[PDB]
Amino acid sequence: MVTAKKDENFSEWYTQAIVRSEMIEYYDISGCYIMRPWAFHIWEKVQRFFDDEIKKMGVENSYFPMFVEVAWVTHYPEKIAIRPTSETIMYPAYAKWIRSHRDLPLKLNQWCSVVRWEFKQPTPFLRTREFLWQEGHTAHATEEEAWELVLDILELYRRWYEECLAVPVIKGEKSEGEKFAGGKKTTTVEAFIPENGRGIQAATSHLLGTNFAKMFEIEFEDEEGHKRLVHQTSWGCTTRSLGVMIMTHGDDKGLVIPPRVASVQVVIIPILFKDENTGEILGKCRELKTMLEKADIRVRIDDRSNYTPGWKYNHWEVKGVPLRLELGPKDLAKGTARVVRRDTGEAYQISWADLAPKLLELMEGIQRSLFEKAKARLHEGIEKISTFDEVMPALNRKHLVLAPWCEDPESEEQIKKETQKLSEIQAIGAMKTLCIPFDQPPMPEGTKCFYTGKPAKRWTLWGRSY
Amino acid sequence: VTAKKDENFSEWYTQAIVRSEMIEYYDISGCYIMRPWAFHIWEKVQRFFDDEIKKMGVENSYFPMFVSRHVAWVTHYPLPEKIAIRPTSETIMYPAYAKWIRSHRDLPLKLNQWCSVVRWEFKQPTPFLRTREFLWQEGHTAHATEEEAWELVLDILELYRRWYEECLAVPVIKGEKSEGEKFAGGKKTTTVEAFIPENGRGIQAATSHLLGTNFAKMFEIEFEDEEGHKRLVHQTSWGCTTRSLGVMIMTHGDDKGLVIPPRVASVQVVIIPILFKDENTGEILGKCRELKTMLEKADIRVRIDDRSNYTPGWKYNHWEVKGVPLRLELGPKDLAKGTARVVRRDTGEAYQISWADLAPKLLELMEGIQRSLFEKAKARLHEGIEKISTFDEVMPALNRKHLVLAPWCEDPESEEQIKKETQKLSEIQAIEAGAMKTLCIPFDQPPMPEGTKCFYTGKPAKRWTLWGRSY
Ligand SMILES: Cc1cc(N2CC[C@@](CO)(C3CC3)C2=O)cc(C(=O)NCc2cc(F)cc(-c3cnn(C)c3)c2)n1
Ligand SMILES: Cc1cc(N2CC[C@@](CO)(C3CC3)C2=O)cc(C(=O)NCc2cc(F)cc(-c3cnn(C)c3)c2)n1
Ligand SMILES: O=C(C[C@H]1NCCC[C@@H]1O)Cn1cnc2ccccc2c1=O
Ligand SMILES: O=C(C[C@H]1NCCC[C@@H]1O)Cn1cnc2ccccc2c1=O
Ligand SMILES: [Ca+2]
């Protein structure tokens, strides 16, 4: 079981939660972690969802080799690099494959692993040296088609997070300082970790435009015979989502997994003690499983002989199975069963004939409530502000600030440095742009930038970050 | 596609997989770009096999790709220790196995992963089939008994057989491997074997190992049984690769190009409207789109090729090289009569079908295609194996691009010296104007007479073993 409290030692809470749920296992080489099945299941679930969705958009999956903060092979010619990202590997193929408008749009995606070999200290799931992800890359005849694909993908990532992991996130555009180098515009979804006040980027959807197109000479001819440059997008998202899910829904007893990505939604734990009604208990469990699976609920019966009922309670609690269904001899005479829901503890006595509808209802209810609570904590962690004097208070309450900004990059860099210096004084760490939210709250006519006094351009979300 | 399969096989293969837009070539030779037309097949069998092993209790994971010294090696970020990239994951996993297994309560442990591996040999690569980087899955289990582990490897091998026969329509022989060719460090290796008739070679489709306890002993993977005695776990491993893809292509290709079994084809039915460039009015494409939704209701993977700059015949050739099994032609005369012309890629036969009749007939065809593609291949299999009885007969059968089913003593020095002699003899013929190893020892052992002798020593022959040249 898990000792530490989420809200006072967050770090050791997090690692107890991911280790004692058999999600992670540690490894020789720092910043690599073994992803055990209990996590891999969730990843498979979100993978299936995103893959179905992007296949509906006409994206096709592919595999490009891993050879081309970078890592280099030495011996067994030339040095070979391991892909940090595969722009450099894919785009020459793109330049060869595209020659006329009749070959656009071209939309490829790949699920693979990448290596980003930073020497700072890792955080499992969140900042690792090898992570699993997807990366998609499209080229279009026009910029407007490309942009709408950027936004369609960003909406998928919203769903990936909100709809599947019940994690609330913010759509926005990245500042010039923090956008992708040599992209034209970088959109993003951003999450919030309330326990340390930090923001974290959840996924990216870049509008590359034509910069790569000309570096790599990816060109096509329209219906006139004139060769134009293609407009490109790339986008991707990683196992970091799992981490953000954990930190969003964990409590002092361990994980809490939203039903939509839980591989076991209902665990049926039989109470056996002193050989009382063992055969009937086990029969009823198997019948309840049959019935619940007929309603497409994912059921496991923990009928393992070598474990105590109370051990099973705590085992599936810490693993975060959303619904536990206890069945013993009393309930055999009653035709009901006790169901405990992992997110609140509440118990219910449900009739067997009512299990399937009722359990479905409970599961929808759990998912929604995980999301709504989470969404609440997010919008209560966002302090809108007018002046820079209001920044450090909010930072110390572990919140983000939403302020008017003039949007020039020197603004951001000196804000970064100044807030890190102030942090170091108070300790005797920096605050950066998180994003420029799509949903722009009202901007009065005369409003001035919260740092420079210059005329404001847009509302911008700032805070400490990963 | 210009080259002719029966004549220049290697140039045939290269053209077939390049002009079908399966592979694209790359700087680093040994590593290829797998484009959608092929990766979809990989996705289809990946899903099949993954569903099947999940229902057996196997669960997926991901281990890292880096194993450290305590094979290709990576040095500079200046490194403290050269780290390698996994060629296989036994050494990355089995320490974790040692840590996670303590009691019989923890058994069985069944894991699996879908990853890429890197085996960096300096001999020349052949795409899909022998690459320096390839996608695979590798599964690793551990059991309390020996019989449990055995049962699981035979079950996995059955799954491999389906993967080849049921999905790719590629027939394969379930066999056991010589102790000379068996996994070093394994106790008994089982395999499925395939046969390329154009170069007469055998090839290892997938393998399923009975590792026994040797790895358990090396890594200290022990459990206490119910009586409290510390015991070694019995382990299995097993793997399959994108080589399946290669085997499939070769198995079914003809002079026009690929032929992809309907069960794994990304496009099962391609709809080619007959618009001879020019104006292109809405009347034709309209019907095609309706037909598409009509067909997708019945779960058919459909594509309309409406690219304006090409002639119907060009498209015909394009999709024939890509190997799509059914081609649906919709022209103005077809529109007038309310029908469509379907022609199967395998035999070239054409059918005129009403639109009502379109969904069932197509499905009845695809089955027909699937089945036929298999059984033809199966015969080309049985016609490649000659049941000889003395060593005198082997060179006439291997120069016939065959494999032979000879009775054998099962003595490993026999194997190594038959390899030596078949190369030598092989070389003299080459000079006048290659080695033959054992492929497997089959499970369907035919009748064995009392005191039949072996085909190379004269000793009492143990079992019928299948030999040929190979990859
Ligand atoms: C799992 C993952 C995801 C993403 N990102 C970035 C992109 C994005 C955004 O959503 C997604 C693709 C679109 C995502 O997931 C970035 C990293 C990462 O930079 N890893 C290297 C590393 C290793 C290490 F041990 C420590 C640190 C480190 C950095 N600062 N400090 C204080 C420590 C970094 N890793
Ligand atoms: C795709 C793939 C699959 C398998 N294996 C083996 C096992 C099996 C069988 O089912 C499956 C996993 C269990 C399978 O598919 C083995 C290789 C491979 O050894 N690659 C290295 C390489 C690169 C190269 F350029 C040349 C050569 C080479 C070797 N001899 N010559 C004349 C050239 C070898 N490659
Ligand atoms: O990876 C990206 C941008 C997009 N490229 C692939 C599609 C999704 C992805 O967000 C940003 N980035 C991040 N880190 C690096 C480290 C070394 C080399 C290149 C990079 C590098 O390019
Ligand atoms: O990979 C295997 C046996 C099984 N191990 C993983 C599951 C499926 C697979 O057949 C055999 N082999 C083959 N080639 C190597 C090259 C370098 C290092 C180790 C190996 C090595 O071990
Ligand atoms: Ca849109």
User: Which CATH number covers residue B405?
Assistant: 3.30.110.30
Q: For residues B404 and B394, is the Cβ–Cβ distance under 8 A?
A: yes
d(CA A173, CA A185): 7
CATH number at residue B130: 3.30.930.10
Measure in Å the smallest separation between the Cα of A81 and chain B Cα atoms: 9
d(CA A137, CA A94): 10
* Contacts for B388-391: CB closer than 8 Å, 24+ residues apart: B388/B455, B389/B455, B390/B455, B391/B455, B391/B456
d(CA B58, CA B52): 9
Q: For residues A184 and A207, is the Cβ–Cβ distance under 8 A?
A: yes
Q: Which of B252, B280, B298 is the C-terminal boundary of a domain?
A: B252
Q: Which of A359, A378, A397 is the C-terminal boundary of a domain?
A: A378
Selecting from A76, A96, A130 the residue whose C-beta is nearest the C-beta of B64 gives A130
Q: For residue B407, what is the enclosing H or E element? A: strand B403-408
* Contacts for A175-178: CB closer than 8 Å, 24+ residues apart: A175/A407, A175/A409, A175/A412, A175/A433, A175/A436, A175/A460, A176/A407, A176/A409, A177/A409, A177/A412, A177/A413, A177/A433, A178/A412, A178/A432, A178/A433
d(CA A174, CA A195): 24
- Are B324 and B404 in the same domain? no
- Are A191 and A46 in the same domain? yes
Cα separations in angstroms, B221 against A205, A306, A326? 45, 20, 35
Query: For residue B85, what are the β-bridge partners?
Result: B66
Q: For residues A366 and A341, is the Cβ–Cβ distance under 8 A?
A: yes
Cα separations in angstroms, A15 against A5, A21, A201, A465? 12, 10, 21, 19
CATH number at residue B364: 3.40.50.800
In which order are the strands placed within the sheet that holds A266-270? Answer: A299-301, A266-270, A323-327, A336-341, A347-351
d(CA B264, CA B247): 14
SS3 category, A89: helix
- Show the domain range for A291: 259-378
SS3 category, A374: helix
Strands A382-384 and A400-405: parallel
- Are B83 and B96 in the same domain? yes
Q: Is residue B2, in this structure, part of any structural domain at all?
A: no
SS3 category, A424: helix
Query: For residue B59, what are the β-bridge partners?
Result: B111
Residues 6+ apart with CB under 8 A from A388: A415, A450, A451
State whether the beta carbon of B237 lies less than 6 angstroms from ligand 4: yes
Is the minimum CB–CB distance between B278 and chain A shorter than 8 Å? no
Burial class (CB in 10 A: 0-12, 13-18, 19+), A436: buried
Cα separations in angstroms, B464 against A234, B381, B382, B386? 57, 17, 15, 12
SS3 category, B373: helix
Is the minimum CB–CB distance between B224 and chain A shorter than 8 Å? no
- Are B133 and B82 in the same domain? yes
Q: Is residue B1, in this structure, part of any structural domain at all?
A: no
Residues 6+ apart with CB under 8 A from B35: A62, B21, B22, B23, B24
- Are B311 and B228 in the same domain? no
**Alpha-helix residue ranges (DSSP H) falling in A73-137:** 87-97
Q: Is residue A254, in this structure, part of any structural domain at all?
A: no
Q: For residues B293 and B271, is the Cβ–Cβ distance under 8 A?
A: no
SS3 category, A178: coil
d(CA A242, CA B437): 49
Nearest CA to B328 out of B348, B343, B315 is that of: B343
Q: Gaps after which residues in chain B, C–N over 2.5 Å?
A: 70, 77, 433
Other C-beta atoms closer than 10 Å to the C-beta of B95 total 16
Q: For residues B462 and B410, is the Cβ–Cβ distance under 8 A?
A: yes
Q: Which of A249, A275, A293 is the C-terminal boundary of a domain?
A: A249
d(CA A129, CA A31): 5
Kindly provide the resolution of this structure in angstroms, with one decimal: 2.8
Write out the DSSP string of A148-172: HHHHHHHHHHHHIIIIII----EEE
Q: For residues B13 and B250, is the Cβ–Cβ distance under 8 A?
A: yes
Q: Could you say which DSSP state residue A451 is in?
A: T
Please give the tally of structural domains in chain A.
Answer: 3
Q: For residues B463 and B418, is the Cβ–Cβ distance under 8 A?
A: no
Selecting from A62, A117, A132 the residue whose C-beta is nearest the C-beta of B39 gives A62
Q: Which residues of A touch B36 (CB under 8 A)?
A: 60-62, 108
- Are B376 and B407 in the same domain? no
Query: Looking at A406-455, which runs of residues are DSSP E strands?
Result: 432-437
Other C-beta atoms closer than 10 Å to the C-beta of B99 total 13
Q: Confirm or deny that A148 is annotated as ligand binding.
A: yes
Query: For residue B194, what are the β-bridge partners?
Result: B203
d(CA A98, CA A95): 6
d(CA B389, CA B169): 31
Q: Is residue B197, in this structure, part of any structural domain at all?
A: yes
Q: Could you say which DSSP state residue A282 is in?
A: H
Experimental method: X-ray
- Are A26 and A121 in the same domain? yes
Write out the DSSP string of B228-291: --EEEPEEEEEEEETHHHHHHHHHH-BTTB----GGG-S-SEEEEE---STT--HHHHHHHHHH
Q: For residue A39, what is the enclosing H or E element? A: helix A37-56
Selecting from B34, B77, B120 the residue whose C-beta is nearest the C-beta of A76 gives B120
Measure in Å the smallest separation between the Cα of B2 and chain A Cα atoms: 21
Ligand nearest to C-alpha A466 = 1
- Are A118 and A240 in the same domain? yes
> Which residue's entry shows tokens 């010296």?
B417
- Residue burial A154-172, b: 16+ Cβ < 10 Å; e: rest: bebbbebbbbbbbbbbbbb
Cis peptide upstream of residue B197 (ω within 30 degrees of 0): no
In which order are the strands placed within the sheet that holds A458-463? Answer: A60-61, A106-115, A130-140, A231-238, A198-209, A185-193, A170-173, A432-437, A458-463, A400-405, A382-384
Q: For residues B170 and B376, is the Cβ–Cβ distance under 8 A?
A: no
Q: Gaps after which residues in chain A, C–N over 2.5 Å?
A: 68, 76, 428
Q: Is residue B78, in this structure, part of any structural domain at all?
A: yes
**What is the gyration radius of the CA atoms in chain A, in angstroms?**
25
In which order are the strands placed within the sheet that holds B326-330? Answer: B302-304, B269-273, B326-330, B339-344, B350-354
Q: For residues B341 and B350, is the Cβ–Cβ distance under 8 A?
A: yes
Cα separations in angstroms, A268 against A265, A282, A286, A392, B383? 10, 10, 9, 50, 55
- Are B19 and B90 in the same domain? yes
- Are B181 and B233 in the same domain? yes
Burial class (CB in 10 A: 0-12, 13-18, 19+), A422: middle
Cis peptide upstream of residue A105 (ω within 30 degrees of 0): yes
Other C-beta atoms closer than 10 Å to the C-beta of A179 total 19
Query: For residue B133, what are the β-bridge partners?
Result: B118
> Which residue's entry shows tokens 């309670």?
A313
Nearest CA to B223 out of B209, B238, B211, B213 is that of: B213
- Are B81 and B158 in the same domain? yes
Q: Confirm or deny that B299 is annotated as ligand binding.
A: no
- Are A354 and A395 in the same domain? no
Ligand nearest to C-alpha B71 = 4
Q: Is residue A5, in this structure, part of any structural domain at all?
A: no
d(CA B201, CA B436): 9
> Which residue's entry shows tokens 């919140």?
A399
Nearest CA to A166 out of A271, A267, A246 is that of: A246
Structure-block tokens of residue A376: 């609440």
Structure-block tokens of residue A145: 């088609």
Nearest CA to A263 out of B108, B60, B110 is that of: B60
Top residue of B66, B223, B266 to mutate, by most chain A CBs within 10 Å, is: B66
Q: Is residue B4, in this structure, part of any structural domain at all?
A: no
Three-state SS for B174-227 is EEECCCCCCCCCCCEEEEEEEEECCCCEEEEEEEEEEEECHHHHHHCCEEECCC
HSE value, Cβ hemisphere, 13 Å, CA-based, for B134: 26
Q: Is residue B3, in this structure, part of any structural domain at all?
A: no
d(CA B16, CA B4): 10
